[PDB]
């Protein structure tokens, strides 16, 4: 007799790629990729995840909370992961704003990149005694407070001259640093303007006014407009005749800021003290359920295979790795012609 060693022969419908033989047919494989399917966004498994800034504040948007609208004040919980669910945030509240003449729409999104965010407990300057005369603090009917009747944003003070209604030269305030040592300070200020008759009635001058700010080498300059405003959007719905322009400046730890102003200033009162860092990707709300990974194109994912094929995007968590092609690991033997019967002659 003749006893020999050999190798099986079977159906070999799979193809793999080697480095010295080219592409070969193999009996079986192990896939290493999937193409996922679009789903909704979830809570990250093991970490606290931020959606809205204050979720216990009802009937508030994120810009409402960032600007300090009355009845939208609350404690902001910490989080190590955030969702950016709104690329151009809106108000629904207080006095009407001309949102598009500054960069204020992006203030909530900035605030969501820090882990700890809080509103100071004291005012940064005393408004009634600031340069430019004794002031009285103005309130608006389109801004009611907890016992209804008149209010304003908690981050600013509308300073109207008390006794002397006259024009002025530019005035300068130095905005101090009131947070603790590792924290950044975000200061919110702005100005108000109206039509000619009301400008002469409130302030004593009916010409455009000039405003300047400076912090950490960054400088900004504005000029106001008298009359002929666009229409009111995203506000309380009462008719008005004037508008406000709002801005913010960042003070890195230890540093002081400067504002130069004329008639119509909204002086800063409460500042945001912010420290730490958070991880942000774009998503949508509500967050339903729990998942291993969050992906910008696919939502929540659970990791099964080590790799994936599809659209590459940003992701946070326990995620697979992106590859160009579907990859396979051989789990068989190379193709073997059914040459039993050839040798069996």
């Amino acid at each position: 007799d003749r006893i020999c060693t050999g190798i099986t022969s079977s159906n070999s419908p799979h193809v793999v790629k080697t480095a010295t033989q080219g592409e070969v047919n193999v009996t079986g494989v192990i896939p290493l990729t999937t193409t996922p399917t679009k789903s909704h966004f979830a809570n990250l498994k093991g970490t606290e995840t931020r959606g809205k800034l204050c979720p216990k504040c009802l009937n508030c948007t994120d810009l409402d909370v960032a600007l300090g609208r009355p009845k939208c004040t609350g404690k902001i919980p910490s989080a190590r992961v955030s969702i950016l669910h709104e690329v151009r945030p809106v108000t629904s509240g207080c006095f009407p704003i001309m949102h598009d003449r500054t960069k204020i729409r992006q203030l909530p999104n900035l605030l969501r990149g820090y882990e700890h965010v809080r509103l100071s407990t004291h005012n940064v300057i005393n408004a009634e005694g600031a340069p430019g005369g004794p002031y009285k603090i103005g309130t608006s009917g389109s801004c009611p407070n907890i016992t209804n009747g008149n209010g304003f944003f908690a981050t600013m003070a509308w300073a109207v001259p008390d006794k002397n209604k006259t024009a002025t030269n530019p005035l300068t305030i130095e905005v101090p640093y009131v947070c603790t040592e590792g924290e950044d300070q975000i200061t919110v200020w702005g100005f108000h303007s109206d039509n000619e008759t009301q400008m002469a009635k409130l302030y004593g001058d009916s010409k455009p006014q000039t405003f300047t700010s400076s912090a950490n080498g960054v400088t900004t300059h504005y000029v106001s407009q008298i009359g002929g405003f666009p229409n009111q959007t995203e506000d309380g719905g009462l008719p008005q005749s004037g508008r406000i322009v709002v801005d913010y400046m960042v003070q890195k730890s230890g540093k002081t800021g400067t504002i130069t102003y004329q008639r119509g200033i909204l002086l800063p009162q409460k500042v945001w003290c912010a420290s730490g860092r958070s991880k942000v990707i774009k998503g949508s709300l509500p967050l339903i359920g729990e998942a291993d990974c969050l992906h910008e194109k696919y939502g929540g994912l659970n990791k099964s295979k080590p790799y994936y094929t599809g659209e590459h995007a940003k992701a946070i968590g326990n995620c697979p790795i992106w590859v160009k092609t579907p990859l396979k690991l051989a789990n068989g033997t190379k193709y073997r012609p059914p040459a039993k019967l050839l040798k069996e002659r």
Binding site: D1, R2, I3, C4, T5, G6, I7, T8, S9, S10, V16, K17, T18, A19, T20, Q21, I30, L32, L84, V87, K103, Q106, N109, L110, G113, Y114, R277, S278, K279, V280, I281, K282, P306, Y307, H312, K314, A315, I316, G317, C319, I321, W322, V323, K324, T325, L327, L329, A330, N331, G332, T333, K334, R336, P337, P338, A339, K340, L342, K343, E344
Partner: protein, 166 residues
Amino acid sequence: GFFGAIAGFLEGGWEGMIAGWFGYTSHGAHGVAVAADLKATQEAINKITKNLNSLSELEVKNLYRLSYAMDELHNEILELDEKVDDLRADTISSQIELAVLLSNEGIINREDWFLLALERKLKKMLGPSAVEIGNGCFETKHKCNQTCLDKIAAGTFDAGEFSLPT
């Protein structure tokens, strides 16, 4: 492989092997008989599994948004950030494809060393009187039917029962 092309091995295989990838076949007066080896198949499977574990246990760092850059005010920085993400994905994909190519190369090459191991296990267990030809086949002085190969592939064959020196 390149080893069996020159050494004179058989270019075809047997479909009587259903319980394994590697095995034995005996050709004689009665015709052909086929049996499968289980331990060789098992450790080939084990090595492929350890290789899969090695491939599945590598980590890279997450890519997420920059904390300080805002839309429509920092467009140049955000374009450069997108380019950085593209380039990093390209580089890691190329590295993973290289690792899988090396893995499949090794898996396909082991098919001749798994067969040399079988050949000389058979030579040891087949007794001093057998003669090696050179291409994995052996010539015996005794009949070997299906139960014979069943005992050979199971590692219980003893030539003493065949009235031949061991």
